[PDB]
Write a protein that binds this ligand. Structure first.
Ligand SMILES: *[C@@H]1O[C@H](CO)[C@@H](O)[C@H](O)[C@H]1NC(C)=O
Ligand SMILES: *[C@@H]1O[C@H](CO)[C@@H](O)[C@H](O)[C@H]1NC(C)=O
Ligand SMILES: [Cu+2]
Ligand SMILES: [Cu+2]
Ligand SMILES: [Cu+2]
Ligand SMILES: [Cu+2]
Ligand SMILES: [Mg+2]
Ligand SMILES: [Mg+2]
Ligand SMILES: [O]
Ligand SMILES: [O]
Ligand SMILES: [O]
Ligand SMILES: [O]
Lengths: 650, 650
């Protein structure tokens, strides 16, 4: 019931997840605990526990040792039944005991999902650090070749560390950017964002997820823009957008497998979409798309009873994210459907669209794996352009809109060269292999090459010519100067390609002062996850003894990995525009304070258990059309400078 | 150097083929034997050993733990270099020592292939029974799910027997006939036929393979006709033929994996052929096809210098098989290419035709696996129709052609009901899993359901009204009466669909006599292979002690499995025409004797180390057009009767 004991409990529950628990205390609980024995431990007096126990007793739950997809409606419903129980627990012993009990009864994929979102969305989970999913379920992050070497290492009872190479061949130009969507941390960022902001969320679970639909737009806009920056760095053109009536040019072979369920399916190059039995017809996707664009071009969403909901206003983008994803916040799912989530399944199933071949779900049908597929970025550019029609519909900002009166950016510079490189990172495959009973384990690791960069610090010189210190928001973006054809981009053509590097609030005293901000402190990024082995060691050292470790150290798992803050760029160097906008922090943070702690990842992942701290539209001030660059040049609190990034190859 | 010791040596060499040998004697030989140390052990005084050793010493051979395809030109060349050495050994110690030495140096797939064809084509191999390849390399015969359970059984050190189900789902109508092409014995029949009659054979290896090109036509004609009989039994239409300019309707997901190389690739439904980089353009296949048909319709094959080779003669079909397969017997590979073998690769590679995805060869690129793919039978019907244009070009047989004067078939009947069913068969997966060092093995088996039938005996009453006993050939075929639409077939429309059930030579004494022939004695079929475990036990029992076991018991591994002699048919029963032709055995066997032993599989697999014993065209007397059924009805030595086959489901 302390953080050390809770962390250890979670560590134990997630250990060797494909086998019955090996911890005597958890075995005893799974044997003897009755989820219905004392309903006073629940806030709903047992309602959720009754629902799940009835499903269990009627033999209606998915078996153990079976693939699980969050996009599968019934499997999701089953996972959410366990989430609902955990979420109702008043105290930790309820949470732990129900987790231990249902770990041994329910499908492992459902259980892991429910336990993670249960920890994230319950106050009882505060202070717990979830192990990286690439060590809890390594199959979802590790190609089949390396798993086989792990299987071989286990079959032969010999330790080893095995190198993971990217999918494809050098003949496949898309392999040039495999280090983006295949990065294990980028995959954790993506799954964790959706765990923090789930489309199935209903506020009856206990609280509201502030601005979720707009953050849904923004986080995926940033994934798309970041991927395109890697393409530009590797002599590739931007991704095309998907369209339902045109071929998906770039196929994909994941070369990965489920632990149970077989190899992930492949998609050949240059295929037309086919209807997917049990999911949707291609034509249904076109109609859904049309209906969303009808709302955007009408300027209003149509409610279930036909009345209009105005979207010509700052929350319009959020309501659009609600209906596009779609989430349970959608005002009218009967009419607007679920374009984005259904599209994930439509794409994921194109290797077996009629269920003739007994193929498991595609990589697009899991947030753990979706960015590994090149078609992820074609789909999300397509979706991004829907949002962009709405954001482009507003009048361009004026001088008066943008000016922070009395605040001028005199200069922008960086301390330290902008240098990227690849280094090596290891994670454990032990959870992927079968052990027991009464046979000892051996160390089995994967080694991956990952993008990284050297530390740097921004130097932003501002002059506050008001006679008072003022809170300011510093908004930092990296923008392309030229496209892959060497063509110089206008600001209007740059703005939608810019990637967010940082956003922070800082008091600017009167006078001229230099603000320093380290790359490591970015509110866009989070560090590499601590290893499962490290979390066990720290939790065990605390429990066996008694030591209050400041676990309030790790960031969150949602956020672009720190190592991927910068695009790869080129060995010969590339020049980019570093764009800084300094805006009125008093107005931006009204209702959430400026001195308050906002965590390490508020730019795209918000603040755990709090409202979103920045009132401005996501992407401000680049999210509206800029047809006249003179407007931005005339605003003293906006400035961009040219910076150079060099890739250091091996 | 005796059969017991040779069998044990082979057993040891093939044991746990993915790991260094565990037998101390073979380890010593691999360490100390010099293939170039005493050239007097070779018939070529070491020429072949020098070629292979140079390749080995120059690091030019395929690494161990890598996929192998006989259709890969360079990998085949490497395997054949080892075959060439084994084939030159004068005595067994040369054969054994070179096998042991190169087992530890060469790729395991190349080694197994070379060792099998070396045993088959060397007189030193006489009396050896090769273990079934499904136990030597189980990955090539076992779906990935079951291998994973084997991997799990090994990782956990627990014995088990695991059920293999057919690929696909019940929504896939092609799964109705998966028991044909996925039968492990049918796969061994196919690989062994090609090992007995390899397209790479050159007579400089020591002997000629009699009528090989015509047997190539015939064995594949019979595979195609037998598959279509299973389709008819399961309410399916006949397979369509492939065409290079039309879609391949039926895709395929093997759900199988290589031990090294990854999962076998899938082919989606309804794809057009694409050019395959490094293999051929689709257009090249069309041109090759056209050139073959030009020879057929000209009535002659064009030699390299332009002179004509007449094919309007009994050996024409053989020369066509030579140029179509193509084999090294082809008179003009520069012009006629290799339609059939290239088509195997063209089909096999359609999941990755441009090498972008790092996918290993398809199931069509191994004789072990090719019949698992539905497209196998569409390709081979296409090829079969090329041969049929030639065979249809000859004048129909006349009464005088067909009559065996003084020999009448008075009656045809069967002792015993014709009943099919499915039963269970087990084979070991131990060679598929990793062991060692110094850790004990455990029993790991696959259980498959396989077609089978009850024993029956033909009763053929003949009257020999010549005043002398006469040798006769009994030719027995099963022919459809109606197609899948309930339409009654004419004899001309039946004949190409008939399947060979038996062919035997027997002296018919003067008078009226009943000939009895058991289904078990069919010259078309061979029994199930003895298990690797059984072969080890019998060889070990002989070596450790001294006992001359009549190993001259097992048939061969080439031949339709006995269990698959009859089509499945239907639970409600199906009627077929049983066609018996009794022909002049003196003329049919001229040059090969009648009383001589022809083995158990001469109909399609010939006689090991001897000429083909039947002079008639393969398929006689059904291989020419029969436009006038009156001709066959007027021949007393031909008779057909209606028989019923019933399937007994579980
Ligand atoms: C794996 O990578 C490490 C460093 O990244 C290297 O030392 C080692 O040689 C590699 N192993 C293999 C088998 O290539
Ligand atoms: C496997 O098949 C056997 C007989 O074919 C049967 O007894 C057994 O129940 C099957 N096992 C499973 C797990 O279905
Ligand atoms: Cu997402
Ligand atoms: Cu998405
Ligand atoms: Cu063949
Ligand atoms: Cu073939
Ligand atoms: Mg299922
Ligand atoms: Mg290779
Ligand atoms: O997403
Ligand atoms: O996504
Ligand atoms: O073949
Ligand atoms: O074949």
């Amino acid at each position: 019931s302390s953080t050390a004991h809770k962390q250890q409990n979670i560590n134990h529950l997630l250990d060797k997840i494909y086998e019955d628990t090996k911890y005597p205390d958890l075995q005893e609980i799974a044997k003897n605990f009755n989820p219905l024995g004392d309903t006073s431990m629940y806030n709903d007096q047992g309602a959720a526990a009754e629902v799940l126990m009835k499903e269990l007793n009627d033999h209606r739950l998915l078996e153990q040792h079976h693939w699980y997809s969050l996009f599968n409606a019934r499997q999701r419903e089953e996972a959410l039944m366990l989430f609902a129980v955990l979420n109702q627990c008043k105290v930790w012993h309820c949470f732990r005991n129900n987790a231990a009990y249902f770990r041994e009864q329910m499908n492992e994929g459902e259980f892991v999902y429910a336990l993670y979102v249960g920890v994230i969305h319950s106050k009882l989970g505060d202070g717990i650090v979830l192990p990286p999913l690439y060590e809890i379920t390594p199959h979802m992050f590790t190609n089949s070749e390396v798993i086989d070497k792990a299987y071989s290492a286990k079959m032969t009872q010999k330790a080893g560390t095995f190198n993971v190479s990217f999918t494809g061949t050098k003949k496949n130009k898309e392999q040039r950017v495999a280090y983006f969507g295949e990065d294990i941390g980028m995959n954790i960022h993506h799954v964790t964002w959706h765990m923090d902001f789930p489309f199935w969320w209903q506020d009856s679970y206990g609280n509201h997820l502030d601005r979720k639909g707009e953050l849904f737009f923004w986080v995926h806009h940033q994934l798309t823009a970041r991927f395109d920056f890697e393409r530009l760095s590797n002599w590739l053109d931007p991704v095309d957008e998907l369209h339902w009536d045109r071929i998906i040019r770039e196929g994909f072979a994941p070369l990965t497998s489920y632990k149970y369920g077989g190899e992930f399916p492949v998609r050949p190059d240059n295929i037309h979409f086919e209807d997917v039995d049990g999911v949707a017809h291609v034509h249904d996707m076109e109609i859904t798309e049309n209906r969303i664009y009808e709302a955007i071009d009408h300027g209003y969403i149509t409610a279930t009873d036909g009345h209009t909901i105005d979207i010509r206003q700052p929350k319009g983008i959020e309501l659009l994210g609600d209906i596009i994803e779609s989430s349970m916040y959608s005002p009218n799912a009967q009419y607007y459907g679920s374009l984005h989530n259904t599209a994930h399944v439509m794409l994921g199933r194109q290797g077996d669209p009629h269920g003739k071949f007994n193929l498991p779900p595609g990589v697009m049908e899991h947030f753990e794996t979706a960015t590994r597929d090149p078609s992820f970025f074609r789909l999300h550019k397509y979706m991004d352009n829907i949002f962009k029609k709405h954001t482009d519909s507003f009048p361009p900002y004026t001088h008066d809109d943008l000016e922070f009166a009395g605040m001028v950016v005199d200069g922008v510079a960086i301390d330290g060269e902008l240098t990227t490189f690849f280094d090596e990172f290891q994670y454990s495959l032990i959870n992927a292999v079968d052990s027991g009973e009464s046979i000892e384990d051996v160390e089995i690791n994967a080694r991956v090459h990952r993008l990284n960069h050297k530390e740097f610090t921004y130097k932003i010189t501002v002059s506050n010519s008001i006679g008072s210190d003022h809170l300011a928001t510093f908004r930092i973006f990296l923008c392309p100067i030229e496209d892959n054809n060497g063509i110089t981009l206008t600001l209007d053509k740059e703005r939608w390609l810019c990637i967010e590097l940082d956003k922070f609030f800082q008091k600017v005293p009167s006078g001229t002062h230099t603000i320093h901000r380290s790359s490591k402190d970015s509110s866009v990024t989070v560090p590499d996850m601590p290893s499962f082995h490290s979390l066990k060691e720290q939790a065990d050292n605390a429990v066996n003894g008694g030591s209050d470790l400041d676990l309030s150290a790790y960031e969150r798992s949602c956020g672009i990995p720190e190592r991927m803050l910068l695009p790869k760029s080129k060995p010969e160097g590339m020049e980019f525009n570093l764009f800084v906008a300094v805006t009125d922090g008093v107005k931006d943070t009204e209702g959430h304070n400026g001195d308050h702690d906002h965590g390490g990842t508020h730019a795209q992942c918000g603040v755990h258990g709090e409202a979103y701290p920045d009132n401005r539209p996501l992407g401000y001030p680049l999210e509206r059309r800029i047809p006249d660059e003179r407007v931005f040049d005339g605003v003293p609190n906006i400035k961009h400078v040219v910076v150079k990034i060099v890739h250091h190859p091996e």
